[PDB]
Ligand binder design. Structure first.
Ligand SMILES: *[C@@](=O)([C]S[C]C1=C(F)[C]=[C][C]=C1Cl)[C]([C]C([O])=O)[N]C(=O)[C]([N]C(=O)[C]C1=[C]C(/[C]=[C]/C(=O)O[C])=[C][C]=C1O[C][C])[C]([C])[C]
Ligand SMILES: *[C@@](=O)([C]S[C]C1=C(F)[C]=[C][C]=C1Cl)[C]([C]C([O])=O)[N]C(=O)[C]([N]C(=O)[C]C1=[C]C(/[C]=[C]/C(=O)O[C])=[C][C]=C1O[C][C])[C]([C])[C]
Lengths: 91, 140, 91, 140
């Protein structure tokens, strides 16, 4: 017998209340930088450990550019919510 | 033990809900790039062994059904679950290609006591969207 | 230059929208079962890895008891939100 | 590199905000057990090397100040941060021993561009409370 709302893992593209960014030629920052990590560590790391490097590769190497005063020079930081009651290792 | 059990015959099923063009009504701008994602994605979970089924531009009453269509299903021999949603959004709300829709009702079918074959297995939800209208000016 | 809302880590005592439990003789389920893990793995594991076993030790071995119809036989499941952009190892 | 930098002279500072007795007005029941925690806690972070300062039953206008008192402070030589809050609560709201208080305003001082010495360091918030009034009947 376990908690129903358990084992659920949600990886939001940004921090609550904030906007999520997107490139018109590569697409999302969050999605490209995510797949790219599962590209390297899909069998090396756990998953939170992946999702965390994904957090850095999006908080560190991504910065908006725009001719708009408001929509320019803006950052983004993902959100890793986890209820999982165990580790995960795709393999 | 400590780490999940992932040695079931079928790794899972990775439905991606690629939403891009929004009903003029919704007033939601057409997301350019969404496509580049859905492909780099479908290709990603294909290499990890998931049954990826991509659906495009689905109204609110449509994502909800697919979901009950997906909760009700023998995931018995399936090891896990992955739902990738790419669309517009607010906080707690995701968007249909016709109207905004409450996230709660979506994820609910797969709840321990509603989706019992998935019970004990990890429901991995990846949401790609607008949790509001705040900008990070960045320090340092 | 980084995202302000970053590096923040919040460990909620339950799942959003839900109640949090408490023992009158040991205290919180979430707090006792947490310290107890940092008691063993404060130098063995990372932290998400700790916080996850904490998730199990609270989702698995804790079940409410009460003479009330409503306040009896209820479970709890913690919530690990993480923005951290790196790993953590207290030592 | 990959893992945080924790080899600063001072591991951090672990303020625990032990709230238990609530102003009859608030109508919040007196939490029995809270104390057993605050002790098992103070003893825990004492062994990991934190400057633990325990404050008890602080009204809403009181937790907020301590916080600005805590954000404004040279955490320069400090490696990290830990705020343990034990009290009643709702979703997004925590309770004072006089009145409910918005979580956002609390955590904000330590934001990258507000608390600059902590910048780059992990702000570890542990909240022990009621995110609403839902029960987990449990499956299996
Ligand atoms: C969100 O879905 C927008 S939700 C808007 C909203 C409503 F209309 C009504 C009620 C609530 C809300 Cl929250 C999308 C994310 C998505 O995947 O569709 N957010 C955006 O589209 C953002 N704009 C862009 O991504 C376009 C853009 C990109 C860049 C440069 C990026 C870069 O990486 O450069 C190197 C600069 C400027 C823009 O345009 C911004 C208008 C939001 C900022 C709108
Ligand atoms: C929450 O703070 C309650 S918030 C209530 C609330 C309002 F009054 C107004 C607006 C919004 C909200 Cl959310 C506390 C958590 C805390 O740390 O103080 N929750 C509780 O106190 C729960 N009750 C108990 O912990 C007491 C209790 C324990 C048990 C047995 C536990 C066990 O482990 O047994 C082995 C059984 C019954 C109860 O009593 C329940 C009334 C909530 C359930 C109230």
């Amino acid at each position: 017998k376990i908690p129903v709302e358990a084992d659920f893992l949600y990886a939001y593209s940004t921090a609550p209340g904030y906007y999520s960014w997107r490139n018109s030629k590569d697409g999302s920052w969050f999605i490209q930088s995510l797949c790219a990590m599962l590209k390297q560590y899909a069998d090396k790391l756990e998953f939170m450990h992946i999702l965390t490097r994904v957090n850095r590769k999006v908080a560190t190497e991504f910065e908006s550019f725009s001719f708009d005063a408001t929509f320019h020079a803006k950052k983004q930081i993902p959100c890793i919510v986890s209820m999982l009651t165990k580790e995960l290792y795709f393999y | 033990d400590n780490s999940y059990k992932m040695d079931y015959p079928e790794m899972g099923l990775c439905i991606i809900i690629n939403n891009k063009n929004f009903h003029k009504s919704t007033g939601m701008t057409s997301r350019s790039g969404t496509d580049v994602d859905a492909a780099n994605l479908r290709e990603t979970f294909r290499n990890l062994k998931y049954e990826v089924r991509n659906k495009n531009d689905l109204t609110r009453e449509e994502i909800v059904e697919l979901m009950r269509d997906v909760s009700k299903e023998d995931h018995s021999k399936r090891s896990s679950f992955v739902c990738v949603l790419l669309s517009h959004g607010e906080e707690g709300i995701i968007f249909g290609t016709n109207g905004p829709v409450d996230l709660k009702k979506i994820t609910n079918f797969f709840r321990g006591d509603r989706c019992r074959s998935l019970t004990g297995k990890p429901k991995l939800f990846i949401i790609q969207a607008c949790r509001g209208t705040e900008l990070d000016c960045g320090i340092e």
